[PDB]
Design an enzyme around this catalytic site. Structure first.
Site, PDB file in Angstrom:
ATOM      1  N   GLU A 153      36.662  38.621  53.409  1.00 36.13           N
ATOM      2  CA  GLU A 153      36.222  38.201  52.085  1.00 36.13           C
ATOM      3  C   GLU A 153      37.146  38.787  51.011  1.00 36.13           C
ATOM      4  O   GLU A 153      37.454  38.118  50.022  1.00 36.13           O
ATOM      5  CB  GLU A 153      34.776  38.651  51.814  1.00 36.13           C
ATOM      6  CG  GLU A 153      33.691  37.810  52.491  1.00 36.13           C
ATOM      7  CD  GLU A 153      33.608  36.390  51.947  1.00 36.13           C
ATOM      8  OE1 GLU A 153      34.202  36.118  50.881  1.00 36.13           O
ATOM      9  OE2 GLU A 153      32.937  35.542  52.579  1.00 36.13           O
ATOM     10  N   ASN A 203      36.044  30.244  41.167  1.00 33.59           N
ATOM     11  CA  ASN A 203      35.714  29.005  41.858  1.00 33.59           C
ATOM     12  C   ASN A 203      35.808  27.855  40.850  1.00 33.59           C
ATOM     13  O   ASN A 203      35.811  28.082  39.640  1.00 33.59           O
ATOM     14  CB  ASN A 203      34.312  29.101  42.468  1.00 33.59           C
ATOM     15  CG  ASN A 203      34.194  30.230  43.484  1.00 33.59           C
ATOM     16  OD1 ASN A 203      34.899  30.249  44.494  1.00 33.59           O
ATOM     17  ND2 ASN A 203      33.303  31.178  43.218  1.00 33.59           N
ATOM     18  N   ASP A 263      33.639  25.729  39.998  1.00 32.21           N
ATOM     19  CA  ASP A 263      32.373  25.375  39.375  1.00 32.21           C
ATOM     20  C   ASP A 263      32.045  26.268  38.181  1.00 32.21           C
ATOM     21  O   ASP A 263      30.940  26.217  37.644  1.00 32.21           O
ATOM     22  CB  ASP A 263      31.248  25.434  40.416  1.00 32.21           C
ATOM     23  CG  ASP A 263      31.018  26.836  40.955  1.00 32.21           C
ATOM     24  OD1 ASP A 263      31.924  27.680  40.836  1.00 32.21           O
ATOM     25  OD2 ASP A 263      29.929  27.089  41.511  1.00 32.21           O
ATOM     26  N   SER A 321      32.010  29.595  38.230  1.00 29.61           N
ATOM     27  CA  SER A 321      31.580  30.913  38.688  1.00 29.61           C
ATOM     28  C   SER A 321      32.754  31.678  39.296  1.00 29.61           C
ATOM     29  O   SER A 321      33.833  31.125  39.509  1.00 29.61           O
ATOM     30  CB  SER A 321      30.463  30.770  39.726  1.00 29.61           C
ATOM     31  OG  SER A 321      30.952  30.192  40.924  1.00 29.61           O
ATOM     32  N   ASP A 333      33.788  35.040  42.239  1.00 25.01           N
ATOM     33  CA  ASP A 333      33.342  35.953  43.289  1.00 25.01           C
ATOM     34  C   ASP A 333      33.950  37.330  43.015  1.00 25.01           C
ATOM     35  O   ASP A 333      35.149  37.451  42.755  1.00 25.01           O
ATOM     36  CB  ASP A 333      33.766  35.441  44.668  1.00 25.01           C
ATOM     37  CG  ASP A 333      33.137  34.101  45.010  1.00 25.01           C
ATOM     38  OD1 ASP A 333      31.943  33.907  44.689  1.00 25.01           O
ATOM     39  OD2 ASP A 333      33.827  33.246  45.607  1.00 25.01           O
ATOM     40  N   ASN A 386      28.928  36.213  44.254  1.00 28.39           N
ATOM     41  CA  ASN A 386      29.031  35.140  43.262  1.00 28.39           C
ATOM     42  C   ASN A 386      28.274  35.327  41.945  1.00 28.39           C
ATOM     43  O   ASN A 386      27.096  35.677  41.928  1.00 28.39           O
ATOM     44  CB  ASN A 386      28.613  33.824  43.924  1.00 28.39           C
ATOM     45  CG  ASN A 386      28.911  32.618  43.064  1.00 28.39           C
ATOM     46  OD1 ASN A 386      28.061  32.149  42.314  1.00 28.39           O
ATOM     47  ND2 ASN A 386      30.133  32.117  43.161  1.00 28.39           N
TER      48      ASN A 386
END
Length: 129
Positions: free
Chosen positions: A35, A46, A48, A50, A52, A59
């Site tokens: 990750e 991301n 959208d 958002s 991480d 998120n």
């Protein structure tokens, strides 16, 4: 901060992740490796809106507030910036909630694609836990 493999394993075991909800320590170290490659400062935006954050890539849309994610909820009650510290306490406590959210570790796409079903015990080799 970039954790050594066993160093992170010790840290996680210390925070109660070994066998948490039935997931062996190897699963968490493996999820962390893919990750964020053990980097507490890792961030991934991301498409959208958002982002991480941290060693376990939590998120911003539902778990932490970074003040720039539409309709974001803050279920872990913390600023996303706190997930970028050298101390993983914040990330672990939030992760404990995520893994109990009805999808097990499937919540972490990298774990699902690279750890699930594999011999995760390997990620703990050489460690004096």
């Amino acid at each position: 901060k970039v954790f050594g493999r066993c160093e992170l394993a010790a840290a996680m075991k210390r925070h109660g992740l070994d066998n948490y909800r039935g997931y062996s320590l190897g699963n968490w170290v493996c999820a962390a490796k893919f990750e964020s490659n053990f980097n507490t400062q890792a961030t991934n935006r991301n498409t959208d809106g958002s982002t991480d954050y941290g060693i376990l890539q939590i998120n911003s849309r539902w778990w932490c507030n970074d003040g720039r994610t539409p309709g974001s909820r803050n279920l872990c009650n913390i600023p996303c910036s706190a997930l970028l510290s050298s101390d993983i306490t914040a990330s672990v406590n939030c992760a404990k909630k995520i893994v109990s959210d009805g999808n097990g570790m499937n919540a972490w796409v990298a774990w699902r694609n690279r750890c699930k079903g594999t011999d995760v015990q390997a990620w703990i080799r050489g460690c004096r836990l």
